[PDB]
C-alpha cells in the first residue's frame, strides 16, 4: 500500500495473508468470507507468464494478523488449504478479466476479536455503493512504493472512479468485471495498492446497515500511485453467481 | 519473517 | 455469516475507527 497508514488493531479482521511455505514469504492478500472460505485474486495462484502455478500444499493462510513478519502468538491462526478454485474464465492471457479465486480451508477457523468474516454484496448494496466518488478501503502488506515493506498492515481509503476515466487511463482492455479507484492528479490526495497487496479486499461500509462489504479484490495497476493511473479491482458482485455456485457445490 | 511453528509445515 | 461485516473491536462495541467517517461522508 502506497501513501496509506498503519491499520488499527482489529480494523480489518477479515484480512488474510497468503503465505508461501518454502521459502517462507508473503505471496498475496486475501479475505475471510466464512469460517472455511477465503477469497483472493486468481493471479496470486495462477499466472503462467511468470511461471506461477501454486498448488494447495505450497501455501498457508494466516488470519488475524497485524504485523507483516512476526509470528503473532495467541492472535493469528494458520490454516491449511483443502482446495483451490479458480474462475474457469479467468483471463490470464490478456487483461486479468475475472481475477478471482476461492480457497477452502481444511478446518474451520475460530472467530475472535481479530478474526471475523466480511460480507459479500447483494445487488442492492452494490448498486447503491458502487458509484464514482464513493470511497472504499484497501488493506495489505504489499510494497510501500513502486520501486520497502511495512512493519504492520497498511490501510488507504480511495474513491471509485468514473468508468470512462478508468478506460482513458490505460491501453489495457477494461471489462465490466473490473472497476478502478484512486485520486485524480488534480485532487491532491493520493494512495494506491501495490505489489503484494493483490488478492486483498476493497471494502465499503454500508450506511444502511453499518456492515462492511467486500466490493473489490486488488487485481492490477500500471506501477503504483502514479499520477493519472488508477488501481483496478475485481468486481466481486459481478462474479458472485460463480462464488455461490462453488460454495453450494463444495 | 519469523519462523512459524513446525506443526503448520 | 449472519454476523458478517461487524467488527468485534468496532461495530460490536459501538466504537468507530479513525477514518471510517471519510467513507460515510463520500456516500451521497
Ligand atoms: N493498484 C496497483 N497499482 C496494483 C495492484 C496490483 C498489482 C499486481 N498485479 C500485477 O502485477 C499484474 N500486472 C499488472 O498490473 C501490469 C498490467 C497488466 C494488467 C493485466 C494483464 C497484464 C498486465 N502492470 S505492471 O505495472 O506491470 C505491475 C507492476 C506494478 C508495480 C511494480 C511492478 C509491476 C499491481 C499494481
Ligand atoms: C497448473 O497446475 C495444474 C495442476 O498441477 C495443472 O494441471 C495445470 O496444467 C497447470 N497449468 C495451467 C493451469 O496453466
Ligand atoms: Na484506453
Ligand atoms: Na494514481
Chain C neighbours, 3+ Cβ pairs < 8 A: A
Nearest to A208, CA basis, from A123, A118, A129: A129
Rounded to 5 degrees, what angle do the CA atoms A205, A143, A18 make? 70
Q: What is the largest CA-CA distance in chain B?
A: 17
Report d(CA A42, CA A101) in Å as an integer.
5
Q: Tell me which fold the domain A1-12+118-237 belongs to.
A: Thrombin, subunit H (2.40.10)
- Residues having CB closer than 6 A to ligand 2 are A 46, 48, 53, 55
Residue position matching grid coordinates 468486481: A235
Q: What are the strands, taking DSSP E only, across chain A?
A: 5-6, 15-20, 25-32, 37-40, 46-47, 52-53, 59-63, 77-86, 101-105, 135-140, 154-159, 178-181, 201-205, 212-220, 231-235
Domains contained in chain C, number: 1
Any ligand 1 atom below 6 A from CB of A27: no
Q: Which backbone phi and psi does A245 adopt, to 5 degrees?
A: -60, -40
Residue position matching grid coordinates 493469528: A76
**DSSP symbol at A67:** B
> Per-residue DSSP letters for A191-205?
-B--TT-TT-EEEEE
Q: What are the strands, taking DSSP E only, across A77-153?
A: 77-86, 101-105, 135-140
Q: Does domain A13-117+238-250 have CATH number 3.40.50.150?
A: no
In chain A, which residue ranges form alpha helices assigned H by DSSP? 123-129, 163-168, 240-249
Task: Give bridge partners of residue A216 from the DSSP assignment.
Answer: A202, A235
Domain boundaries, position C20: 1-28
Sign of CA dihedral A150, A30, A217, C22: negative
Report d(CA A106, CA A84) in Å as an integer.
11
Task: Give bridge partners of residue A116 from the DSSP assignment.
Answer: none
Q: Say which residues have a Cβ less than 8 Å from residue C24's Cβ, sequence separation at least 6.
A: A205, A207
Between the CA of A53 and the centroid of ligand 2 the distance, in Å, is 7
Report d(CA A58, CA A80) in Å as an integer.
10
Report d(CA A238, CA A147) in Å as an integer.
33
Q: Say which residues have a Cβ less than 8 Å from residue A50's Cβ, sequence separation at least 6.
A: none
CATH number at C28 reads 4.10.140.10
Atom 10 of ligand 2 has which residue's CA nearest to it?
A: A53
Q: How many CA atoms lie within 13 A of A98 on its CB side?
A: 15
- The domain ranges of chain A are 1-12+118-237, 13-117+238-250
Fold match between domain A1-12+118-237 and domain A13-117+238-250: yes
Resolution to 1 decimal place, in Å: 1.5
Q: Which atom of ligand 1 is nearest to the CA of A231?
A: 1
By residue count, chain A amounts to 250
Q: Which backbone phi and psi does A216 adopt, to 5 degrees?
A: -140, 165
Amino acid at each position: 500500500i502506497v501513501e496509506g497508514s498503519d491499520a488499527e488493531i482489529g480494523m480489518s479482521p477479515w484480512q488474510v495473508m497468503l503465505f508461501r511455505k518454502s521459502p517462507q514469504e508473503l505471496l498475496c492478500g486475501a479475505s475471510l468470507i466464512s469460517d472455511r472460505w477465503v477469497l483472493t485474486a486468481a493471479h496470486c495462484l495462477l499466472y503462467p507468464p511468470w511461471d506461477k502455478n501454486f498448488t494447495e500444499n505450497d501455501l498457508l493462510v494466516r488470519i488475524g494478523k497485524h504485523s507483516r513478519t512476526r509470528y503473532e502468538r495467541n492472535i493469528e491462526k494458520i490454516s491449511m488449504l483443502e482446495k483451490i478454485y479458480i474462475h474457469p474464465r479467468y483471463n490470464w492471457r490478456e487483461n486479468l478479466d475475472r481475477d478471482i479465486a476461492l480457497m477452502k480451508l481444511k478446518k474451520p477457523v475460530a472467530f475472535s476479536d481479530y478474526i471475523h468474516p466480511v460480507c459479500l454484496p447483494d445487488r442492492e448494496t452494490a448498486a447503491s455503493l458502487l458509484q464514482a466518488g464513493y470511497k472504499g478501503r484497501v488493506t495489505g502488506w504489499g510494497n510501500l512504493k513502486e520501486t520497502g515493506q511495512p512493519s504492520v498492515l497498511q490501510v488507504v481509503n480511495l474513491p471509485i472512479v468514473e468508468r470512462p476515466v478508468c478506460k482513458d487511463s490505460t491501453r489495457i482492455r477494461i471489462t465490466d468485471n473490473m472497476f478502478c479507484a484512486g485520486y485524480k492528479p488534480d485532487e491532491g490526495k493520493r494512495g494506491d495498492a501495490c505489489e503484494g497487496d493483490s488478492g486483498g479486499p476493497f471494502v465499503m461500509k454500508s450506511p444502511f446497515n453499518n456492515r462492511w462489504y467486500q466490493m473489490g479484490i486488488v487485481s492490477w495497476g500500471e506501477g503504483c500511485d502514479r499520477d493519472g493511473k488508477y488501481g483496478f479491482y475485481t468486481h466481486v458482485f459481478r462474479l458472485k453467481k460463480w462464488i455461490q455456485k462453488v460454495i453450494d457445490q463444495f | 519473517f519469523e519462523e512459524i511453528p513446525e506443526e503448520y509445515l | 455469516e449472519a454476523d458478517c461485516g461487524l467488527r468485534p473491536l468496532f461495530e460490536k462495541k459501538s466504537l468507530e475507527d479513525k477514518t471510517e467517517r471519510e467513507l460515510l461522508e463520500s456516500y451521497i
